[PDB]
Fold Glycoside hydrolase, family 20, catalytic core.
Amino acid sequence: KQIADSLSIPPVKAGAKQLPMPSVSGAQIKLLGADYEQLVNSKGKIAPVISDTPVNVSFKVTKDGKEAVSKDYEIMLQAPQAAQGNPKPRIIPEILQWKGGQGEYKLGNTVTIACPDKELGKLFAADMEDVLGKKVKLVAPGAKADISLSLLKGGNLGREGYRLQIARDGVRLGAAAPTGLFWGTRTLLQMLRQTPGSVPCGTAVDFPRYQLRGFMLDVARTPYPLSYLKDVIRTMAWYKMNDLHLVINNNYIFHEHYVDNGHDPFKESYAAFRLESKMKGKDGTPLTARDLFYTKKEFADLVSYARKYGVNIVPEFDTPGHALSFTRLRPDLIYKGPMNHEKRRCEMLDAANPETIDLVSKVFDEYMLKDPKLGRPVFADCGVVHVGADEFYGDKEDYRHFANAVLTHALKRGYTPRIWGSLSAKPGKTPVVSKGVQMNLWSTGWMKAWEAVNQGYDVINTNDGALYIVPFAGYYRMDRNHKGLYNNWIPNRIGNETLPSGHPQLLGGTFAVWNDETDIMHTGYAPYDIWGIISGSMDVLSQKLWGTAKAPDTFEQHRELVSSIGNAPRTNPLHKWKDSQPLTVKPSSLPQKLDKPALGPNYRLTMELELTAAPEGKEQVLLAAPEGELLAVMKDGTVGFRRDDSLEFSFGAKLPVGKKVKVEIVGEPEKTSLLLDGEPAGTAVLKNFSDKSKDFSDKFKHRPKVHRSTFILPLKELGSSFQGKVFHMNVQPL
Ligand SMILES: CC(=O)N[C@@H]1[C@@H](O)[C@H](O)[C@@H](CO)O[C@H]1O
Ligand SMILES: [Cl-]
Ligand SMILES: [Cl-]
Ligand SMILES: [Cl-]
Ligand SMILES: [Mg+2]
Ligand SMILES: [Mg+2]
């Protein structure tokens, strides 16, 4: 142990093909690993590089019968001398290796692409057409082509690496595997976004330092439509991130708010399970969420779509904590033992009870075993399934029994389980399986990194202090620390612990958006409202997950480059129009088809209309599209709207019946305002949850501090169910 502690790694000869092993007579020393396994394999063989590249190596020392691992030692692999030529193109994430060439390759008026993968070819070509505004055509593999993609045999590129060579006779993108081909297309498209007319000659060789480069989204505590998730997928792939963890069930955190204000959280707290399910509780209430859910076909197709983009989707069912969706099915299976946070008992499943593992395993089997309609499991393309198991505040040995059981069930079904690390705060003698188990290291206090590694888990840096975002909250504000993360964050530093970067049990890292301030705390923020902080986090963390331990530029230069490269191809997350030209419609009869794209802020909608009948309790839709509905009359008679995340908002004002009126709706980020005849009629307020807390006194301190009300303007159909006349309509992007 002392040997590894004080090992001395000398400089590597320029061009050496084998790493010299350190020698100490008392013990045995072997390579623990290199952060770039592609450059130094487990046996110490060093692959050639085309530009100087740093590699961190670390060693396992065995003295007597004791083992110990060293710290990281940085070595510098040196390329042979060259004329250097063109500078390295600036990409996010950075291209690892580059040898510049001479001149440019000029793109023609039309572009041809040779691709052995038909699906990749079609996707790449449509992305190219969107980025270039030119016609792109797929030709036969092996035929003359401007851009030729091929699979290479042998080599060190692995599943995700690629070699991109640009010469005067065209572009050649080679990869050991189609995933590397896809990443190479991402690189080429980012290049063409900066200079669409030509690309610098030279050779890039590129591959990731970490194989798991992930994002976790809490889609349980507030809803997200599939369209937003597809934006997320394409933008992750744009920055070469590849692991999307979706929280399928969970519930409002602060049950004590209900308890302390005289209400039962078991009856009142928001809870959601987001997949279509046959499961129904004792009272007959379904497991599947009512406000928004994904069908089994929708989820399987979403997984396959993400796979097209090189992204693995990981679904999480969270038990035995955070399981109010399950205890509502089986209230007899509520945990009855001692616990911290006793007012949150209603979400705790009876971990030691055999009927609990029966229920949970049945739910898992609905998606892990063959589905009769799909002819295959809903999770057939999910190699990893997350079994949750965070923050169970009850008995340690009960918890360990249950966690072992659910992990074992996933493994027996042929899936790789991922779990929230909880075994430092829940130690015990009940064995918890570790072989083949992945683990999010989210809290040092719940699970020490070195303890997790020594117990045999494959670990993912998910540390709450560095990587957690709770939107618009007073804590976990990683969205405010993007510069610090860019300059300082590395995947192998996990809180106050540092693993060697080449440790074989370190898979990479994941950042997380947790929607704590929801239900009766919900300010009405939309998915749109966090897009900037999500994308921004990606454009920083992608660099540190794919690239080296040092940022290639300053944070400010990085964000300049982010702006120059732009959004993912065929992705319009802020719902902007191509040009700021207004839309004017004189309607002839209602309903009237508009077939215009939805419009995000900022905008002004102006209408001259007359509501001619308002039957009580009847909803009247004035504008509609998949993105939402503008309701001239809601069930309570007011003007309002409903978004594609199912959240409903009211302006608190009513249209007059039988009177011409000028309606103006002004959409800004987090605020939509209504004016009637030029007079401020109101600002929209979220309606979904406030009725539960309406009669709480001011001893309750957690009302929404701001009323947010973003509205993506729907413009597919006018007057779907409007009982009135529309004389004039104008939509002005601002
Ligand atoms: C594994 C995990 O993160 N568990 C909880 C999570 O449910 C919560 O929403 C988030 C932010 O407060 O952090 C923890 O308290
Ligand atoms: Cl060196
Ligand atoms: Cl802060
Ligand atoms: Cl949205
Ligand atoms: Mg949208
Ligand atoms: Mg590694």
Remarks:
- The radius of gyration is 28 Å.
- The CA atoms of residues 280 and 286 lie 4 Å apart.
- The first helix runs from residue 2 to 5.
